[PDB]
Symmetry: C3
Subunit: 298 residues, 3 copies
Amino acid sequence: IAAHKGVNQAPVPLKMERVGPHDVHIEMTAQITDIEIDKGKIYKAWTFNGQAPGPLVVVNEGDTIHFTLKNMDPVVPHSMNFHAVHASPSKDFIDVMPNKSGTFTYPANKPGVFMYHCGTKPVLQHIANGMHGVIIVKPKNGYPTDKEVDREYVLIQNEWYKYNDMNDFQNGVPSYVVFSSKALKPGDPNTNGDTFTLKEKPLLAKVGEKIRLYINNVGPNEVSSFHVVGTVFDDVYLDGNPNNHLQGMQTVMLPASGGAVVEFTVTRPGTYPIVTHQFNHAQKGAVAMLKVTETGED
Amino acid sequence: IAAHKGVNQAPVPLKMERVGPHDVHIEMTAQITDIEIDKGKIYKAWTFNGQAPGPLVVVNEGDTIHFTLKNMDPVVPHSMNFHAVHASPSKDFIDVMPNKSGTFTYPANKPGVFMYHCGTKPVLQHIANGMHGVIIVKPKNGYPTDKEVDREYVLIQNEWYKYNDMNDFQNGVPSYVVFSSKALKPGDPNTNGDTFTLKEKPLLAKVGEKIRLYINNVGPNEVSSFHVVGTVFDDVYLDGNPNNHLQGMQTVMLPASGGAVVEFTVTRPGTYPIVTHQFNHAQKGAVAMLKVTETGED
Amino acid sequence: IAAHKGVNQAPVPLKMERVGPHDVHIEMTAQITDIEIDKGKIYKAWTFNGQAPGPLVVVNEGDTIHFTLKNMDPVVPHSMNFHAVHASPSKDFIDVMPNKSGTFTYPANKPGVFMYHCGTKPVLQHIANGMHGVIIVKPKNGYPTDKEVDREYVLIQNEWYKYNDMNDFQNGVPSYVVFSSKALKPGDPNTNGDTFTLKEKPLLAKVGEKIRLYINNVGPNEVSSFHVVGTVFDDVYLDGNPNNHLQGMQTVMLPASGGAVVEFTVTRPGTYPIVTHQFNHAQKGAVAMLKVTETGED
Ligand SMILES: [Cl-]
Ligand SMILES: [Cl-]
Ligand SMILES: [Cl-]
Ligand SMILES: [Cu+2]
Ligand SMILES: [Cu+2]
Ligand SMILES: [Cu+2]
Ligand SMILES: [Cu+2]
Ligand SMILES: [Cu+2]
Ligand SMILES: [Cu+2]
Ligand SMILES: [Cu+2]
Ligand SMILES: [Cu+2]
Ligand SMILES: [Cu+2]
Ligand SMILES: [Cu+2]
Ligand SMILES: [Cu+2]
Ligand SMILES: [Cu+2]
Ligand SMILES: [Cu+2]
Ligand SMILES: [Cu+2]
Ligand SMILES: [Cu+2]
Ligand code: NA
Ligand code: NA
Ligand code: NA
Ligand code: NA
Ligand code: NA
Ligand code: NA
């Protein structure tokens, strides 16, 4: 795209603020930002806020979201589809033109771990170029295991293909499959989908802890066989809905866009890989690490 | 196949009639019929009754099916495998030769949304060329959410490959992935697996309704990440068995041959896409539309 | 690998013995063994004990496993990862060098049907070359349907690729997809992952029986759509955990490394195919047979 040559828009922080007991404002950008997806490999990603996947959004069950998208792309329209919400797609998930903003309002009625993404046609192109992310909707009544959880993180799986290549997007294997982590609390890591950061800077935990991961496989195209080496999931809530409660799973099958809340215990000090067990994808980048120490500090 | 050149057998209606409180007769054909699977692209499909996927069958839990296949193919044997039934495959799912009929009897003991397909070796070839469909077995005691449902439709996902090409069937990506709808009540659409009909003639609903979809991914080869844009599934019954009850799912993972009953609420007027969220497949055709109006009429 | 040329190490029996009410010893080898994966096609597999998948391990919930690996490979290190156990991967799943042994101890706290595999980097290479298997952990309180089961077997699904070809392992379709059975009781078959043995020598059962299969899809790369022709699964326990209880499923979606306990009734004499319903994989070998006779003998 001629108008994207040389464009590298600096990341912009997510803007969120609560405006009522059940109403929140969210503003994001659509912007074109260079991301190092593998060592020496830059992808000029189509992004929300200069991150791919985009910034984490967390709201409460029953919140109405007043969402603004500011399109900084000089030529391509962009939009927003939140899987969390009940909305009219043809009125509320519509395109925002270059250098314009649009505001859309809709409720998040359902607890869970939802994908969000750009919904501009061709949707495959917008997702594959980087316009994906997660919104967590916290259940009003919690999860039955909340009291047992010591530490929690968010992980997202995505693929990367040949740059802006619709033939490859439709017909080719992924070049990379990757994990990223998005921060829930101050001090948590906040990373983009790449083959290396969560290997070189593992997530941290303490011996004996029960860890919760909020996970989503945003695709665009693959399913995920999510597994933590050296443990078994004590409890799994499919899509993060507390009703969808499995126990003692080795591996959680996630569709494309599928989410889960998974919980597991780390019993011994060491480094614990986190994979998709589709090992072709793991080999192409989709391995993160959890470093478990006697203190929980590095 | 030399004997199929120029052959285009007109579709033949499904013949069904109840013959006892727990016994039904079903007659279908195997026939060779040209279907427009994408604009300008004719596939000389191997079919039941001149439809691909084939005609919808609906029976009640506990019905015994007395099934007749009339093979109109001039050269290829065909057969019938219903996933709904308990049967001896080597006695009851056997081949019917060209220009012959066979009758097979077996019970449908289990409620749900089942695949049916030709079972003639090589089964991949017969399924991929179009010999797939759905049989719904209605639960004797219903679903716990029956009273909440306002409107219901059937959707089926399938793939299409290069014509009768066993190398492609085994080793290649699908050329098209498609949805079709099969009629449950007079006035419902009844379509074949193509890339366009359910975009140009969306399914219809009314603002505020709870919609039930009976869905099955017949493959032959892919899994499906089934998602309705702008809503969340209130309730999901895996394989249509009332016991297998999930709530609040964004996306339902279907294996090849996998079924579900899914229910969701449409809260606002507009057009709602229905996808597999494996977006390579969506791009290759697997997007249907649901048009939601203030009246439920177009 | 030059040091593997001409190497064909004869299979070695699994060594297991109970050493306390909640402690068991297991010794396995890593060894290089020629396996006929399709007629006329030898794969010089990387194996545990000269089988691929490896030998079946069965323990009780709450057993601690004292595991020894004896590496007979002349040049490649190998290791062991049991999905059943809680362990430190970086201390307990570590490499054993050629011509050495290592012993590792860890508890199997969770009931189910778990994958095991070599964990040596690149893990994809070790799994794809044959270093995979199943460990069953029997639930202390059984399954609620135990009293109904008449006969049981273990089935494992795996893929085979071009020989030791990491490009193919990462980027190519499988050349073969296969089932094997591993013996639970004297007289049960014990086979390797090949395209033919369970067709030519079907598993045996008796008309009217309820059959339990302990199943796992070890991959390395594909998911599985597990289906028995001519029946419906009465009960399914995902990952073999008794809590994860589905009923009346036609087909069970298994992630890579995913397990299940599935139970079904065979109502009539005949031969019943067992497939992955991803029919490209079935065509490439993944069809086993269950022969149901009036006596249960051939
Ligand atoms: Cl692993
Ligand atoms: Cl979508
Ligand atoms: Cl089948
Ligand atoms: Cu309030
Ligand atoms: Cu506002
Ligand atoms: Cu966009
Ligand atoms: Cu979406
Ligand atoms: Cu704790
Ligand atoms: Cu009656
Ligand atoms: Cu009759
Ligand atoms: Cu046929
Ligand atoms: Cu089938
Ligand atoms: Cu209503
Ligand atoms: Cu004891
Ligand atoms: Cu010992
Ligand atoms: Cu190894
Ligand atoms: Cu593993
Ligand atoms: Cu019995
Ligand atoms: Na792929
Ligand atoms: Na792919
Ligand atoms: Na494919
Ligand atoms: Na495919
Ligand atoms: Na594949
Ligand atoms: Na593959």
